[PDB]
Amino acid sequence: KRIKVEKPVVEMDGDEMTRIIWQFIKEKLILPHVDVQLKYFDLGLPNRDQTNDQVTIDSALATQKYSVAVKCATITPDEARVEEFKLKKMWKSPNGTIRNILGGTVFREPIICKNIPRLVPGWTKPITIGRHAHGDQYKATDFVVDRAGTFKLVFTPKDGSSAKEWEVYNFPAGGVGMGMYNTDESISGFAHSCFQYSIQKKWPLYLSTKNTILQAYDGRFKDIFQEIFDKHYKTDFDKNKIWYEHRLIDDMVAQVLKSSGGFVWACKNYDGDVQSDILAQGFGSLGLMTSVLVCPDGKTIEAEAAHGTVTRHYREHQKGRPTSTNPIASIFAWTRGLEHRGKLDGNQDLIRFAQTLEKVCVQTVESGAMTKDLAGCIHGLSNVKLNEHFLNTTDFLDTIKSNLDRALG
Amino acid sequence: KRIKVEKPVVEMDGDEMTRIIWQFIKEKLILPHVDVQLKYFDLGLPNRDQTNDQVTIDSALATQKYSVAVKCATITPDEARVEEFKLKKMWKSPNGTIRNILGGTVFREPIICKNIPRLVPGWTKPITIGRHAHGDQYKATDFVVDRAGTFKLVFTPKDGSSAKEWEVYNFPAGGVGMGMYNTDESISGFAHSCFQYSIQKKWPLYLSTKNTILQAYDGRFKDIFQEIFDKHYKTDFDKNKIWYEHRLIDDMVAQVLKSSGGFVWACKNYDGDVQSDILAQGFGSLGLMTSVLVCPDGKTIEAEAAHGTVTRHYREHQKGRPTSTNPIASIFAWTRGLEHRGKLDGNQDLIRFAQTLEKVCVQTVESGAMTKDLAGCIHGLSNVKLNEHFLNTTDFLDTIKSNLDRALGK
Ligand SMILES: [Mg+2]
Ligand SMILES: [Mg+2]
């Protein structure tokens, strides 16, 4: 019997090869077991252009309403994509837009498969990055200086007090300038979520900044975290034999590499983007990773596939040929979506299905049935072969489907 | 008989554990075998405070004059350091101030010992990071927003063109803002350095940015590198079977961790700081890495230890507790300083001494005498033990001192 879900799930469609596997996953794994009401938004690049990127804002507003989104990987366009898709604007990142509106922390962690070898031998336990999802480089204003001139910052107070101007630089010739920001509210919510997840895991927490160089900007991150820790969380950290410490970013990453894992890592928005990929790759593969935005309100989430759209595999699919594409991150976006939908509704049957599918995915890879990229981690890309070391995208999903049916019975 | 050194070498002194190691090296390893005139500048935090940070500017000026600096790792103040040292102001990064005056690229690579298992087993060849030494976070203007108000950017052209304003954010409550920049001239020189270094090494080059998010700012880096590649280097890269590619920083770092090395990695100022510590640590230790600021003119350099002051080892050493800090990167700052001084003057004995001291360091570790960090790579950090697997800071330095005297004795 299919599990009845009462409240809706927001579904965000994607691009190229991820768009196609997103549909297979829905057909083969999700819908045959779950009767769920889907609130569809096409964040494919053609439709984002068609709606002047308004579909992206509505998908986020819908997520605030219904409290659970699941997202397919999308194209953030450059010059090349603007020419290829004939876009009228170089539209901003859908991910950055959705994260800004919703706010909160993007938690990312590996999907550990026993047989997929780590590139960092020392990491015996997993690590979780809490990436702050708001502000900084993902809400910056930047520009090209094409001639001599003065660049300055200006802060005009609301209360009526005098404006403060800072002369940033008197450009003699061309260059670039940018401004970015963040709020106390956004940093406080970011801190709270990280402290709570650390208690939940029984793991210590590390904040990373460069407050020696950005003494006001990064110092505020250090100050707010240490304030919230002292007043709200120090007692709960002591009871669980865990701690909190601020580290300089360059010191942190070395320490992380030397570690054995088993900690939470609060990263700034930019650092989260960079270091989550070092984490994913170090644990075995970029495709073996979850990514879940947890909003400040505690109720709303957005689960996503954090990787790209796999353009090379898509081109082959256009020419009627078979591909071998890892669907696990996309699968885990659905399960994390459905699990939280089940938590809010009090639907234990749904929660159990999501966890069962996550386990079946790992077991299928651990049994030796896998896609080309994962088989390449084991035997090397030069030594792998079809129906010997790896399977087609749909065949792997069909293997996952068979194992999912056996587990449920 | 000391080696006479005709011309001076600028010396920048530092803080905490590196300051103590710096003085051992100067006193006991360098000037008993090298008659060298040192233009001494104390960039220890108390003297920077004493001089209103002018000594930092004066050290940078002196490096331009004599073309060679050797620097000890320094403290950059935050709020805690103002309390600690009772500072007049929250002074800026002296490395920032030095790098901004001198300009150039900071080249960073591992110091390889056959004896030391990597944390990243895949990296069978070394990797060099060309770090851009100018602009971005290290020249930024940042501030605390402590009341409601609007933050904007304003560009006013010098020759009468229309001025442009951009609203960054309307703050309802408290927060933070910042503005930063870089220049076409600085980024072009950064490209030239990295392309030239790549052709020397016969290695491919990668530039990392986030041009998909920072369309203008990071796009400018991508465009200038590509123009300069096609105008000056593309032919030579193709002839030498090497290549240049741009990659998104997040894509790049994953590629690095999975690679087997053998490439140059052009990093922006911020990225180069973070990624150079990943690199040193992955090859074995923060103590086994060189760092050289190569200026545009092709003559001036500043050699340093990439790693910090080792504050956590300094707190133990202050209270008399056991300590084992790796001095090799700090020694290699002296040797690359002297080697370059020797190369400029045509002083062959001074070049040989520098290289002899580098061989002594590597052969000392390769013979089984080492500091804790390196012992941990072999035996595991949770099983190493004082005087069984590793030596003290002083006992390891005395071992370098003993082996050095024996080396040039032979
Ligand atoms: Mg990323
Ligand atoms: Mg550093």
Author numbering:
A (entry chain A): 42 to 450
B (entry chain B): 42 to 451
Give me lines lifted from the publication on this model.
The isocitrate dehydrogenases (IDHs) compose a family of enzymes that catalyze the sequential dehydrogenation and decarboxylation of isocitrate to α-ketoglutarate (αKG) in the mitochondria or the cytosol. Hence, IDH2 plays an important role in reactive oxygen species (ROS) removal in the mitochondria or the prevention of age-related diseases. In this CR-mediated pathway, we have shown that mIDH2 activity was regulated by its acetylation/deacetylation state.
To better understand which lysine acetylation sites regulate mIDH2 activity, we created a series of lysine-to-glutamine (KQ) mutations to mimic the acetylated states in mIDH2 in vitro. On the other hand, the structure of the K256Q mutant was solved at 2.3 Å resolution and belonged to space group P32. However, the regions involving N-terminal residues 40‒145 and C-terminal residues 329‒451 in the large domain of the K256Q mutant were closer to the isocitrate-binding pocket. The surface electrostatic potential of both structures showed that substitution of Lys256 to Gln led to the presence of fewer positive charges. Furthermore, the shortened distance enabled Gln256 to form hydrogen bonds with the carbonyl groups of Pro118 (2.5 Å) and Trp132 (3.7 Å), which eventually enhanced the conformational change.
